[PDB]
Symmetry: C2
Subunit: 266 residues, 2 copies
Amino acid sequence: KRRQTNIIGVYLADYGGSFYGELLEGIKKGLALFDYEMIVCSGKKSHLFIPEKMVDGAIILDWTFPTKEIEKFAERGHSIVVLDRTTEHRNIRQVLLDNRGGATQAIEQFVNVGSKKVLLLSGPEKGYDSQERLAVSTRELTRFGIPYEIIQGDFTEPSGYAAAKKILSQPQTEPVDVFAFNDEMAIGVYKYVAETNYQMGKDIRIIGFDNSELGAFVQPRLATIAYSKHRWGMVAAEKIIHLMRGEAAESEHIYTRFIEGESFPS
Amino acid sequence: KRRQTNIIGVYLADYGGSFYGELLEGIKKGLALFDYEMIVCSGKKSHLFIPEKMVDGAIILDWTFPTKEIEKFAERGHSIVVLDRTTEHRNIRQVLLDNRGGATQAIEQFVNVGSKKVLLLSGPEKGYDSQERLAVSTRELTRFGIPYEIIQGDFTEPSGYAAAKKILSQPQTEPVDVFAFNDEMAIGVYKYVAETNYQMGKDIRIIGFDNSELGAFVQPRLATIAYSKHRWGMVAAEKIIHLMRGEAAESEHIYTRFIEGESFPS
């Protein structure tokens, strides 16, 4: 009520730096049209100090930012767009990835190639994006009679590295088939395989998610699920303006496509 | 005096995401040993709201964060490590890149190949790192009788793109020789050259700075100036602890090396 700073706080988790740059650019461009600016905050304790007397509204992409804290910030008059979870609270809207369509498109490729086992390298289990990706992956693998193992990660590259070390210790099937829930965990897998006799694409077949630009230039090209990161940010920016101006700001999804790569010969 | 939150505020500019991840990991690891944690803030207006009642000290890598604001935060009892400028104020220390040695090593390669003109794609002119890099580059080019043009950028990839469009409009020398002051501006040059008949390494020869991992996988490999980003962060973290504990925390430099790449056949 008493303040309009024309600043949106953007709360990131700092795994997703493989898509953050182009997401942030889209947020920036969308906000500039309405003379708004953005500050970006990241860290485990970043939700403890929200400058609520200095920020008009928030765009949240951080699974460690607790939902109860989001609701409390919404009830004090601040508008919020979540990019990482679903909500029913007033003053909050959603701009989410189509995780169900993305995971279906990736897991379809393992089916179409006749996979004998699929290893599901997931992110945080309390995180919505991984939950949706898991619910659809496991359902389709069951449907087609394909066994799976779920390996816990945290969306960061170190967890993908540790996963690959855990995977390639135990005896696996002839090719090792991996669905990494993001490109960063997949790059972590590349890192460890570079320290082994294993050949990427041949001995270990991988599909990621996010379409990081590093994945496009790595050897061989990381097969992945792509979406427009610029538009994700643009739509989030327009949604936060419309929402705080009392207007119609319906929750939306960002749709995906599979991009083929020699890391998964299909 | 009245608070110890065990949190360090890290103020970044959000160009340098090509080195931020490994810099931040080094900060994190160095701080965890002393049971400290970090929050990261970025944006043009991020210095206007410093949670001074919620953060013990600051690590600054942001040229838009004004020096006068840094001094004011230092005089209120907070300890600061700068990674982007020099200081003489008490409560502030420096952990800086060896810009003079880095620019000397890059510009030596243009000399050794017998360059006819060197195009100097700089960052922000008020930014210390670019100033030092420019002062050493221009001095050595003059010394060896090599002409130069200084082209203004801002350390971000869009400015490298715009620079390449400006460069390749005007008639230049037989190979176009470019010293990009960071890898991101160099990647911007790659982007535009991919939309032209020009061949990277042959028609346009480039050396960057930072040793981004994208530069290692791009075609051809971006010749660059490398330093340990992990250690830059580690030393900054140990310096902020020592400084706020009243101890001896001398200002230091992070030293560099040239890494050869087929973008500059030498």
